[PDB]
């Protein structure tokens, strides 16, 4: 009995590899996110379930994330291209402290600074004063205030017809390539998965920019589930997803005006107007006992991978960078720096809550220092409601003696926001050419 | 008001099945090497002329075409072009396994077989190329005596 | 300083003729699918050339998966289902053009494709290896 060779088509062979992906707006159902260079898609991608397949995923090691980060950065730069640069601002300022109709916790904040600035004709000049913050100018030698970033990268202005709200995004599969999907509920970020189905497009994904808390995220199935690779390596981070959301009120407590100043030919800058009314400070407000129930669920889920007679302690974070000092986000085209150093005073054996917030204007982007974009102050009263879906936790090293472990917030690498969503999907290559042995023989 | 109905085999419908039975969905599996989005792409096919992004899409399309050409051309080198399967004249080397066929054809799947035989590759390619050369043209030249 | 000496058929000249007679000019179209070349402008040139390549490879792949590859017109073993039309064999071949027939059957395409793929796979290739052994 001699045996022979045969060669086949159609064998599904999987090679874990990398490719450029395929943008998809949800039928382009409609600005920064005007997303004209993207594709209208089916709101009902077809879903095919499988059998018998086990498959390993590897969270933190997926090239979807890096492509996502580059694409969102380049689209962010694309939106801010055609608008008017702000080069002649780097003259000095004649300032004075605002001493009119003060409130308690807004001392030293607002300043009144007047200066020379050119008109649209070269041969002239003018006098302009505008109301400015304290987090934006520096002393020189009234006192004399120059600006924060004139001895570094330049400053432009976003156009006022350009919204900041995120839009749900789908990714889909380029030809020749496939996407697999797991359906376990308690599936940790690595390890196998025996329940396999496949699609051609992702679900709706919102590019949400947050700094300390998962906002507008995805709720889990059952409870708190905890995601990290190596909890003994305390240099890593710990990704935590909730079950149930937390409603959170934060609002701009003030009434606001805005000027419109001419710079040059076709060059108009928007400065801050003059405030109608008195002065307040921005605040944030949450439930009381629901937070306690939430951290009770936290304690209930921490007990598996480490000790339960080990006592749980919360603390303020280590401090430092304003990227990770306050919790920041993008409600209503404005950026909020909220003093979260009161919510994390806790230690447990395993109505209204109010915190102040801060506002800036000169906004460096993701981690880059070679870019600076200025927002126009929006008039009126801003109110923003959202949810809270998860936390990013850091633990110190050297925590010996089997109890009283300390947890702190942090994690200023915003790819983990994407890792907190894309933990289900995997891109793989098809190689349809296969061989096999058999007993038959061909003929001449 | 959209209701669904009757069924077919479908894309990747037999990846966890017995190879002797899963050997018959090769058509639907092999159709989508050049598609998968078989839908108004033409407008963005048109107006993306002054950017790098349509250039990268052009990169992707040309690369996919070349991969299909590499596969079909390498099959075309052998005398098995234009077919789904073919038998040949290389005797199997029983050094590579000695399992009976009743386990492979009944209780073994494709990815298992992939993880088994993944080092014997280029030897098999060379032997198939040899039998598609030796006496496939030489004795065929000797079979060209009319 | 030229003259004109027409010999062969026109490009799509037979389109207004009847199907069974216009079946004999099928060469000229496939003769004229991939020619015409025989800053922004070269960009859209390459765009057009890539589109032509893609459609030609798509249709040759659809030829190749069927057992009617390489050659021109052929046969099969799928018996006709009369749920699509019910003519009596003269009204089509002698009394109907191609655009008429295309507007008559442009809802049943994918089923016919799939069933030809089915009969091309099944009882043709596993059956071949059944016949390749006593």
């Amino acid at each position, epitope marked *: 009995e001699n045996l022979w060779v045969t060669v086949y088509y159609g064998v599904p062979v999987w090679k874990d590899a990398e490719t450029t992906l395929f943008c998809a707006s949800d039928a382009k159902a409609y600005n920064v996110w005007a997303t004209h260079a993207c594709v209208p898609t*089916d*709101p*009902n991608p*077809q879903e*095919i379930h499988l059998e018998n397949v086990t498959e390993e995923f590897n969270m933190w090691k997926n090239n979807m994330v890096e492509q996502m980060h580059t694409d969102i950065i380049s689209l962010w730069d694309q939106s801010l291209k055609p608008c008017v640069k702000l080069t002649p601002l780097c003259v000095t300022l004649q300032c004075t402290n605002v001493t009119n109709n003060i409130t308690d916790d807004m001392r030293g904040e607002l300043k009144n600074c007047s200066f020379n600035m050119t008109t649209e004709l070269r041969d002239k000049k003018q006098k302009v004063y505008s109301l400015f913050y304290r987090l934006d100018v520096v002393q020189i030698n009234n006192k004399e205030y120059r600006l924060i970033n004139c001895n570094t990268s330049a400053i432009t202005q976003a156009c006022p017809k350009v919204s900041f709200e995120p839009i749900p995004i789908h990714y889909c599969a380029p030809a020749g390539f496939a996407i697999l999907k797991c359906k376990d509920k308690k599936f940790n970020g690595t390890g196998p998965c025996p329940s396999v189905s496949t699609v*051609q497009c992702t679900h709706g994904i919102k590019p949400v920019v947050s700094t300390q808390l998962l906002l507008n995220g995805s709720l889990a199935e059952e409870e708190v589930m905890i995601r990290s690779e190596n909890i003994t390596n305390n240099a890593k981070n710990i990704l935590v997803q909730f079950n149930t959301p937390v409603q959170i009120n934060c609002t701009r407590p003030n009434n606001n005006t805005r000027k419109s100043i001419r710079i040059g030919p076709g060059q108009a800058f928007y400065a801050t107007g003059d405030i109608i009314g008195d002065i307040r400070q921005a605040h944030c407000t949450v439930s009381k006992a629901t937070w306690n129930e939430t951290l009770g669920k936290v304690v209930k889920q921490l007990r598996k991978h480490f000790g339960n007679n080990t006592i749980i302690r919360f603390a303020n974070s280590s401090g430092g960078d304003l990227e990770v000092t306050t919790h920041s986000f993008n409600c209503g085209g404005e950026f909020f720096y909220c003093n979260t150093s009161g919510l994390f005073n806790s230690t447990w054996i395993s109505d209204s809550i109010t915190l102040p917030c801060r506002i800036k204007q000169i906004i460096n982007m993701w981690q880059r220092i070679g870019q600076a974009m200025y927002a126009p102050p929006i008039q009126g009263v801003i109110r923003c409601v959202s949810n809270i879906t998860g936390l990013i936790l850091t633990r110190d090293g050297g925590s010996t003696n089997s109890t009283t472990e300390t947890f702190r917030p942090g994690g200023g690498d915003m790819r983990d926001n994407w890792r907190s969503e894309l933990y289900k999907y995997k891109v793989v290559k098809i190689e349809p050419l296969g061989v096999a042995p058999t007993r038959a023989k061909r003929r001449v | *008001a*959209v*209701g*669904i*109905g*009757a*069924v*077919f*085999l*479908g*894309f990747l*419908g037999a990846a966890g099945s017995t190879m002797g039975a899963a050997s018959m969905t090769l058509t639907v599996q092999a159709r*989508n090497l050049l598609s*998968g989005i*078989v839908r108004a792409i033409e407008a963005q096919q048109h107006l993306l002329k002054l950017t790098v992004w349509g250039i990268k899409q052009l990169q992707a399309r040309v690369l996919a075409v070349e991969r299909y050409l590499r596969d079909q051309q390498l099959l075309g080198i052998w005398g098995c072009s234009g077919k789904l399967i073919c038998t040949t004249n290389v005797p199997w080397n029983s050094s590579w396994s000695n399992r009976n066929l009743s386990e492979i054809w009944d209780n073994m799947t494709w990815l298992q077989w992939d993880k088994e035989i993944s080092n014997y590759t280029q030897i098999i390619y060379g032997l198939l190329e040899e039998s598609q050369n030796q006496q496939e043209k030489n004795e065929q030249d000797l079979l060209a005596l009319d | 300083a030229v003259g004109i000496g027409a010999v062969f058929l026109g490009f799509l000249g037979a389109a207004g003729s009847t199907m069974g007679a216009a079946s004999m000019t099928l060469t000229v179209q496939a003769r004229n699918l991939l020619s015409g070349i025989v800053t922004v402008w070269g960009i859209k040139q390459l765009q057009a050339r890539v589109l032509a390549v893609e459609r030609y490879l798509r249709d040759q792949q659809l030829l190749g998966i069927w057992g009617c590859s390489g050659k021109l017109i052929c046969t099969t073993n799928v018996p006709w289902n009369s749920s699509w039309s019910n003519r009596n064999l003269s009204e089509i071949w002698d009394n109907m053009t191609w655009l008429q027939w295309d507007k008559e059957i442009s*809802n*049943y395409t*994918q*089923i016919i494709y799939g069933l030809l793929e089915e009969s091309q796979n099944q009882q043709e290739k596993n059956e071949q290896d059944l016949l390749a052994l006593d």
Partner: antibody, heavy 135, light 113 residues
Framework: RVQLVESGGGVVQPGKSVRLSCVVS????????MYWVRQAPGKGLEWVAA????????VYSNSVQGRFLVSRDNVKNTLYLEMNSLKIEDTAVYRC????????????????????????????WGQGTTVTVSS | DIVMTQTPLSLSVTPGQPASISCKSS???????????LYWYRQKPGQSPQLLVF???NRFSGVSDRFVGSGSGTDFTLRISRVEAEDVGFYYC?????????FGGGTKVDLKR
């Protein structure tokens, strides 16, 4: 033109069975699916059930599920509606109806195999029929 | 399921007096093709139901040109014009986006008695 017929109404008791009828004049029935609606005497209105173009797609509601049956011959131009395991609160008016336009042949999706059907809502009614359930 | 709402039910006006009836819901009833599912129906007591329109601002054969509605996306509406004798009765809103099919509230117009 096109004119509807709704027979089989009155008063019954629980624990029974019915067969209904709807024959509508001069209409093809090879291309047209059709519906059922329901008029409670307290002005309750609710969709009931739908048939395909050729009896190949059966979708019911929640309360009627696993109890009723729809069947149809298009040759005899005759519709059959049969009900079992009768509740007392089934007291209402039953009315036969038609689709707005005709759908065509079924659509296929090649990347799935899921042979799709397409529907759209109704246009016209008839006279209806009234079956009430009491003790 | 996919549900909806109407305006308040009763209405009693005089002839030559336009008004507005809306119909909101919980979802965009846009389908894939761009056709957006919305039916307006009416009847009276002692009267079978009747077809008024079949789409957003698209009316049916036999209906007068007095009755053309509006409203797209998730807010759907209707505008009464030229109040006449036969303008009384029940006014219905209907979905056909997905199973099951839903029936609205049934606003009503009559005269003063």
């Amino acid at each position: 033109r096109v004119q509807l017929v709704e027979s089989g109404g009155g008063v019954v008791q629980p624990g029974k069975s019915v067969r209904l009828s709807c024959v509508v004049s001069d209409f093809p029935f090879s291309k047209y699916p059709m519906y059922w609606v329901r008029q409670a005497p307290g002005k309750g209105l609710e969709w009931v059930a739908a048939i395909s173009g050729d009896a190949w797609h059966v979708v019911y509601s929640n309360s009627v599920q696993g109890r009723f049956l729809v069947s149809r011959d298009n040759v005899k131009n005759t519709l059959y509606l049969e009900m079992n395991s009768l509740k007392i609160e089934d007291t209402a008016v039953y009315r036969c109806a038609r689709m707005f336009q005709e759908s065509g042949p079924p659509r296929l999706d090649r990347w799935s195999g899921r042979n799709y059907y397409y529907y759209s809502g109704m246009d016209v009614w008839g006279q209806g029929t009234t079956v009430t359930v009491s003790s | 399921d996919i549900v909806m709402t109407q305006t308040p039910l009763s209405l009693s006006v005089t002839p030559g007096q336009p008004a507005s009836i809306s119909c909101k819901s919980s979802e965009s009833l846009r389908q894939s093709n761009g056709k957006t599912s919305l039916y307006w129906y009416r009847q009276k007591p002692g009267q079978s139901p009747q077809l008024l329109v079949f789409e957003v601002s698209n009316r049916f054969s036999g209906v007068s040109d007095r009755f053309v509605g509006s409203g797209s996306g998730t807010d759907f509406t209707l505008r009464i014009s030229r109040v006449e004798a036969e303008d009384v009765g029940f006014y219905y809103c209907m979905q056909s986006k997905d199973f099951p099919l839903t029936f609205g509230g049934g606003t009503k117009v009559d005269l003063k008695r």
